[PDB]
Every structure is written in C-alpha cells, then in structure tokens.
Amino acid sequence: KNPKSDKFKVKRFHHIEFWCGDATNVARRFSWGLGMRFSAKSDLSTGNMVHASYLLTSGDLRFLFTAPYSPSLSAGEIKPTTTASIPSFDHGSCRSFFSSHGLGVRAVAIEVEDAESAFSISVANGAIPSSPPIVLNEAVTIAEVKLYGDVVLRYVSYKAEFLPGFERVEDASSFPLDYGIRRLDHAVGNVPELGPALTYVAGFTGFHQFAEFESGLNSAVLASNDEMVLLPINEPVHGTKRKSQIQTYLEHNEGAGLQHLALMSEDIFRTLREMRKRSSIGGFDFMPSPPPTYYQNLKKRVGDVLSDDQIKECEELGILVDRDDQGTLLQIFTKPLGDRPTIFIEIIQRVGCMMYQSGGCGGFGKGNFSELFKSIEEYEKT
Ligand SMILES: Cc1nn(C)c(O)c1C(=O)c1ccc2c(c1C)c(=O)n(-c1ccccc1Cl)c(=O)n2C
Ligand SMILES: [Co+2]
Numbered sequence: 001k002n003p004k005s006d007k008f009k010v011k012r013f014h015h016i017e018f019w020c021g022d023a024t025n026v027a028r029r030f031s032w033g034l035g036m037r038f039s040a041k042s043d044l045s046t047g048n049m050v051h052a053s054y055l056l057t058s059g060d061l062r063f064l065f066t067a068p069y070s071p072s073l074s075a076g077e078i079k080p081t082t083t084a085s086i087p088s089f090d091h092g093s094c095r096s097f098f099s100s101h102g103l104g105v106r107a108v109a110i111e112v113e114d115a116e117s118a119f120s121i122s123v124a125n126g127a128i129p130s131s132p133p134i135v136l137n138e139a140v141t142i143a144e145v146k147l148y149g150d151v152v153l154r155y156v157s158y159k160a161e162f163l164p165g166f167e168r169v170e171d172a173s174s175f176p177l178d179y180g181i182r183r184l185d186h187a188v189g190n191v192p193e194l195g196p197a198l199t200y201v202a203g204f205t206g207f208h209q210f211a212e213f214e215s216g217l218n219s220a221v222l223a224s225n226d227e228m229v230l231l232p233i234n235e236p237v238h239g240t241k242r243k244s245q246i247q248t249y250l251e252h253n254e255g256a257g258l259q260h261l262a263l264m265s266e267d268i269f270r271t272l273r274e275m276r277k278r279s280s281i282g283g284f285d286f287m288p289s290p291p292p293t294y295y296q297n298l299k300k301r302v303g304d305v306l307s308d309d310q311i312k313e314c315e316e317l318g319i320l321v322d323r324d325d326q327g328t329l330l331q332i333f334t335k336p337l338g339d340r341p342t343i344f345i346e347i348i349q350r351v352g353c354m355m356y357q358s359g360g361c362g363g364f365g366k367g368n369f370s371e372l373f374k375s376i377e378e379y380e381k382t
Contacts, residue, residue: 001211002223002227003373005207006126006224006225007121007122007204008112008113008117009113010110010118010205010229012228013108013109013111013183013187013228014111014156015055015094015107015108015109016062016063016064016105016107016184016187016261017064017065017096017102017105017109017154017160018063018065018066018103018104018105019094020065020067020098020103020260021066021096021103022067023053023054023065024052024067026065026103027063027065030056030063030065030293032177032181032278032282033264033275033278033282033283034056034058034283034284034345035058035178035180035181035271035275035347036056036057036061036063036183037175037176037177037298038044038053038054038173038174038175039054039055039056039062039162039169039174040054040161040166040167040169041054041055041166042085042086042166043169044069046165046166046225048085049073049077049083049164050067050069050073050074050082050083050084050089051067051068051069051084051086051089051090051094052068052069053066053085053086053166053339054066055162055166058177058178058182058263059181059183059184060179060184061181061184061263062162064107066089066106066342068091068094068095078330081350085136085165085166086163087131087134088130088131088142088152094106095223097150100254101149101257101340101342102338102340103337103339103340104257104258105151105257105341106150106151106152107144107152108151108154108187108258109153109155109156109346110153110154110155110156110229111156111158113157114157115141115142115143115156115157116141116143118143118157119132119133119143119145119155121204122145122155122205126200126203127146127153127200129146130144130145130146131144136163136165137165138159138161140158140159140163140164141155141157142156142157142163147201147231148189148191148197148201148233148256148257149189149191149253149255149256151189151256151257151258153296153311162305179265179270179271180266180270180271181271181347182265182266183263184261184263185262185263185264185350186221186230186231186262186360186364187217187230187231187258187261188231188232188233188234188258188262189232189259190234190235190246190249190253190256190259191235192236192255192256193235194219194220194233194234197235197256198220198222198243203230205224207220207224207229207231208222209221209222209223210227212324212361212366213363213367214240215369216240216244216245216246217234217236218234218235218244219275219366220232221233223359229265230359232364234246234259234360236250246259249341252340252342253342259342259344260344260346261345262345262348263345264349264350265347265349266349267349268319268330268347269313269319271318271319271347272317275347276317284334284337285334286332286333286334286335287317287318287332287335288318289315290318290320290376291375291376292315293375293378293381294375295312295315297374297375298314298321299311301321301323302321302323302328305323305328306328314380317332319332319367320368320372321368322364322367322368323361323362323363324363326358327352327353327362327363328350328351328352329348329351329361330349331346331347331365331368346379
C-alpha cells in the first residue's frame with residue numbers, strides 16, 4: 001500500500017553535502033575511490049571568502065564537500081553582504097559539527113517544486129527549522145529543516161548550474177573518471193529511538209512507510225509518493241550477545257547521524273572491480289567477504305536470475321544478493337569512510353520491477369542477516 005500522502009511535491013535526491021575539515025583532501029580521495037568527476041567549485045578563486053566547496057558527480061549522483069576558511073577572511077561581512085555561495089553555512093556550526101562527529105553528512109538534499117512552500121508546509125507540520133528559504137540570484141531557492149541529530153533535510157527548487165556562485169571546473173582539472181555509479185538510492189540515519197524519529201519525519205513530510213518482505217537493529221523506511229526518495233532509519237537493539245553496530249555508531253558519532261549512503265550502479269560488477277583495484281592506493285576498503293558457502297547457497301536462492309558465471313563473479317567481488325517477492329538486490333558495503341566507525345557506503349544494483357524501474361525493487365537486504373549467519377556454517381565444512 002502507498003497512500004501517496006506527500007505534503008509537497010518532491011522530485012528526486014539532489015545532492016549530499018559532507019562537512020569536512022579540509023574539503024580538498026576528502027574530495028580528491030572520494031573522486032579517485034568512487035570514480036566521480038570534479039564538476040563545480042565555490043572557493044577563494046570564485047570570490048567565496050567564507051567556505052571552500054567542491055562538487056563531485058557521477059551520473060546523477062552529486063557529492064558536495066565543504067570546509068570553512070578562517071573567519072578573519074570574512075569578518076567584515078554580514079549576511080546581506082556575504083560572499084558564501086551556500087547562505088545556510090556558518091563557521092561555528094561547521095566547526096562544531098566536525099569536532100563533534102568527525103567527517104560525515106551534514107545535508108541530505110532533495111529537489112522539490114518550490115523550496116519556500118516545502119519549508120513552510122514542513123514547519124507548519126512539526127519540522128524544526130534550520131535555515132529559512134533564501135533565493136539565490138533569482139534562480140534557485142534553498143531551505144533547511146532538521147532531519148535527525150545534526151543532519152538537515154535540504155530543499156532545493158529551480159525556476160528553470162549546480163548553484164549560483166559555483167563555477168564549472170576547468171576541463172584540465174576535471175578528469176572523466178567513471179566506475180558506473182549513477183544515483184543515490186537511499187540514505188540511512190541512526191537514532192537512539194526509532195518511533196519518535198519516524199513520527200517526526202513522516203509527520204512533516206507526509207512520507208509513508210515503505211513495506212519490507214540477532215540483527216542488532218530495528219528499522220523502517222520512509223518513502224516519497226513515487227518511492228524514489230527513500231529515507232530508512234535504524235535504532236539499536238540492546239542486550240544482545242554481539243553489540244549492536246547501531247549503538248557503536250551512536251557512541252563514536254556522539255549521537256544520531258547519517259549511517260550509510262547507498263549508491264546505485266548501472267554495472268555493479270564493473271564498479272566493484274574498479275573500486276577494489278584502488279582500495280590500497282587511496283580508495284575505499286570493503287567489508288570482509290562472506291564464506292564460499294554463501295555463494296554455493298546462491299544457486300537455490302537466485303539461480304533463476306543469475307547464471308553460474310554471474311554467481312561466480314559475485315563471489316570474486318564479495319557481492320551480497322537478496323530477494324523479495326518483487327525483485328532482486330545486489331549489494332556490498334565499504335569499511336567506514338573516515339577515522340571513526342560511523343558512516344560507510346553501500347553499492348547496489350536492482351533487478352526487476354520494470355514498469356523505468358520502481359523504487360526499492362528487491363528491498364534493502366535484510367534477508368542477508370539470516371543468509372550470512374546460516375552460511376557461516378562454513379565452520380562445519382572445515
Ligand atoms: C539492514 C538495512 N536496512 N536498510 C533499510 C538498509 O538500507 C540496510 C543495509 O543496507 C544493510 C543490509 C544488510 C546488512 C547490513 C546493512 C547496513 C549490515 O551493515 N551488515 C553488517 C552489520 C554489522 C557489521 C557489518 C555488516 Cl556488513 C550486514 O551484515 N547486513 C546483512
Ligand atoms: Co542499505
């Protein structure tokens with residue numbers, strides 16, 4: 001069931017913004033590790049005396065990396081005279097966020113029909129305002145409300161290239177890397193209490209529960225009307241034998257925050273080959289691969305969707321496979337992206353649910369908890 005109860009018109013995920021201490025080094029690392037191109041910048045060379053912001057793109061996926069300059073460069077400015085290209089930016093907030101949480105996501109941005117209306121309706125329905133609607137060069141409107149922890153949901157709407165004040169990056173500086181990633185599939189938050197978090201967000205968006213179908217978590221998925229914007233939220237399950245990874249996140253992050261970004265690939269085999277080649281030369285590492293029993297068990301589970309050769313490719317790359325009643329999911333998880341055991345990335349590709357492909361096809365892999373535990377029966381084979 002999908003009641004289509006969105007309180008304003010939502011289009012698609014627009015960008016993810018990381019708050020950094022040094023945006024240059026994080027952006028260059030992510031660019032090489034994920035195969036994303038430098039597409040736009042706003043920094044000292046563009047007249048921005050407030051913050052350095054670099055935009056990476058792969059298909060429709062947009063990652064923004066922002067860090068503050070010395071406040072002294074902009075001390076004479078006031079908000080009416082600011083050179084910042086993102087008017088919600090604040091030196092104090094950014095430095096406080098990064099000191100508290102380390103490297104992580106500050107903003108989940110969605111494109112909407114009218115960011116001013118989305119903001120107004122959201123706040124009228126319980127959203128905690130974070131930054132009021134601001135019109136940039138009479139062309140783009142941006143507004144922000146609290147999502148969870150110190151993460152904001154950012155609304156962007158365009159009258160008719162990223163944001164005014166950003167310049168396209170010199171082609172000499174923009175190497176056309178591409179490992180197959182094409183869009184953001186979902187963005188997952190960790191909170192101490194799931195119920196109040198879900199009630200808050202669903203309350204002010206009108207997003208509905210997206211249906212699914214030891215683990216250390218309880219979770220639920222909020223979805224937009226066409227189920228293309230997917231915002232899962234997890235809470236820890238305490239008292240278990242193996243400590244919940246959600247609780248570990250909360251401790252090392254100093255509370256709620258964004259846990260993982262799921263990036264859709266148009267060719268997950270190629271994406272993982274390219275990312276794995278670069279793991280030890282500046283890119284990203286992946287979680288340990290499941291035992292060979294897991295891939296032996298794939299035949300009975302998904303042998304009608306993946307050939308034996310395609311199954312052997314999953315084993316070579318350490319890919320996980322799950323299936324619901326509608327479609328099939330291929331997924332894999334990186335190790336944490338920075339120093340702390342907090343945020344990580346999921347790479348995903350979905351098979352089925354052709355209508356275009358409907359959102360959430362195959363679910364989110366919750367079936368792989370049982371399949372991993374059972375398949376670690378490889379102890380018996382030994
Ligand atoms: C769950 C879930 N719900 N929703 C809405 C999602 O989007 C997800 C995830 O994508 C998802 C799915 C399966 C997972 C893990 C995650 C994050 C995971 O983190 N670990 C895990 C747990 C602890 C340590 C290491 C790992 Cl890989 C696992 O084993 N499995 C099997
Ligand atoms: Co996921």
